[PDB]
Amino acid sequence: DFEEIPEEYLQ
Amino acid sequence: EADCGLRPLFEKKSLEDKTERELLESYI
Amino acid sequence: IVEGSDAEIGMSPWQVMLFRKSPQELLCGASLISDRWVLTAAHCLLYPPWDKNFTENDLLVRIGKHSRTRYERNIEKISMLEKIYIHPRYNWRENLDRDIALMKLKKPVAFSDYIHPVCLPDRETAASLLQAGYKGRVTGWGNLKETGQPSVLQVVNLPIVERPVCKDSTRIRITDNMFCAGYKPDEGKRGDSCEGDSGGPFVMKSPFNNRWYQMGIVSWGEGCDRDGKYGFYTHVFRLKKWIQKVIDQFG
Numbered sequence: 001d002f003e004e005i006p007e008e009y010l011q
Numbered sequence: 012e013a014d015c016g017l018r019p020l021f022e023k024k025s026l027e028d029k030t031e032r033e034l035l036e037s038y039i
Numbered sequence: 040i041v042e043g044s045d046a047e048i049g050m051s052p053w054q055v056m057l058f059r060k061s062p063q064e065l066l067c068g069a070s071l072i073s074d075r076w077v078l079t080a081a082h083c084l085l086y087p088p089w090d091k092n093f094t095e096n097d098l099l100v101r102i103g104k105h106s107r108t109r110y111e112r113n114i115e116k117i118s119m120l121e122k123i124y125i126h127p128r129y130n131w132r133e134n135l136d137r138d139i140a141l142m143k144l145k146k147p148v149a150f151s152d153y154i155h156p157v158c159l160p161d162r163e164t165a166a167s168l169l170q171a172g173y174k175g176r177v178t179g180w181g182n183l184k185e186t187g188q189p190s191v192l193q194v195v196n197l198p199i200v201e202r203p204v205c206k207d208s209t210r211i212r213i214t215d216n217m218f219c220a221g222y223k224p225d226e227g228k229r230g231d232s233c234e235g236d237s238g239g240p241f242v243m244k245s246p247f248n249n250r251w252y253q254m255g256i257v258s259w260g261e262g263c264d265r266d267g268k269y270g271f272y273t274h275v276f277r278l279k280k281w282i283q284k285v286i287d288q289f290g
């Protein structure tokens with residue numbers, strides 16, 4: 001239910 | 012920190028939030 | 040938060056969301072205490088009865104938020120964790136005694152109108168303000184009811200309760216590292232923290248210097264907002280020597 005966060009924070 | 016606990020949009024501007032007075036009134 | 044209201048913008052600029060990377064979901068609240076250190080409840084990170092044992096790479100911290108679910112572009116900041124420190128005497132086996140943990144961020148966060156640290160109490164501020172009847176404020180994105188979830192950060196003001204009333208409300212063993220807060224059944228008003236608010240701050244505004252101090256951490260309770268039950272909070276001042284030792288040794 002959360003908006004996806006920028007991919008840079010998951011790298 | 013030296014500036015801890017002073018909110019930019021409230022204390023730093025001398026503005027009060029809508030319910031902080033309830034806290035103050037309890038400190039008796 | 041049960042029976043609270045929507046926070047104002049910038050009302051709680053120390054509020055932190057602990058966020059699971061995969062699957063992407065809220066884990067807990069937390070608070071910002073400097074540009075590199077976040078304070079939370081140990082049970083947010085380690086609770087073996089529920090198979091919970093999060094490591095640094097599992098998690099992110101989101102700071103400056105208002106909306107629960109939206110990515111708040113140009114406002115929130117998302118930080119990675121360098122290291123988690125759990126109190127060495129955190130009692131997950133029995134009663135959550137010493138329910139406190141610190142997280143060091145990989146890089147310092149820039150303060151802004153929406154991002155600013157809370158103070159930790161000194162002995163005198165704690166003695167003056169941690170008195171029955173004196174009210175603090177709890178914030179979080181947790182459940183709106185025991186048995187759903189808010190669009191934006193919620194806030195509720197709650198009175199500290201006399202220790203014998205806290206003790207007489209539960210069968211769980213209470214310790215000096217905890218306090219309880221909430222209204223009594225006869226007092227009419229109500230409100231409580233709840234699941235999902237774990238780890239967030241219980242704050243008080245000092246009338247001496249007009250600064251906000253974090254006196255407690257949302258820790259435990261039986262249900263949410265039940266008559267005759269109270270929320271239990273980790274007593275931050277009682278554990279401050281450990282906080283200072285960690286930050287001095289590892290900061």
Ligand SMILES: NC(=[NH2+])c1ccc(CNC(=O)[C@@H]2CCCN2C(=O)[C@H](N)Cc2ccccc2)cc1
Nearest residue numbers: 133134135232233234237258259260262263270
């Ligand atoms: N104020 C509240 N009503 C409230 C209630 C719950 C929470 C979140 N905390 C929890 O859910 C914690 C984690 C382990 C079990 N637990 C609880 O709060 C348990 N319901 C009671 C309990 C069990 C074992 C030890 C201590 C307390 C946070 C706030």
Ligand code: NA
Nearest residue numbers: 206207209210
């Ligand atoms: Na009891």
Ligand code: NA
Nearest residue numbers: 264265267268
């Ligand atoms: Na209650």
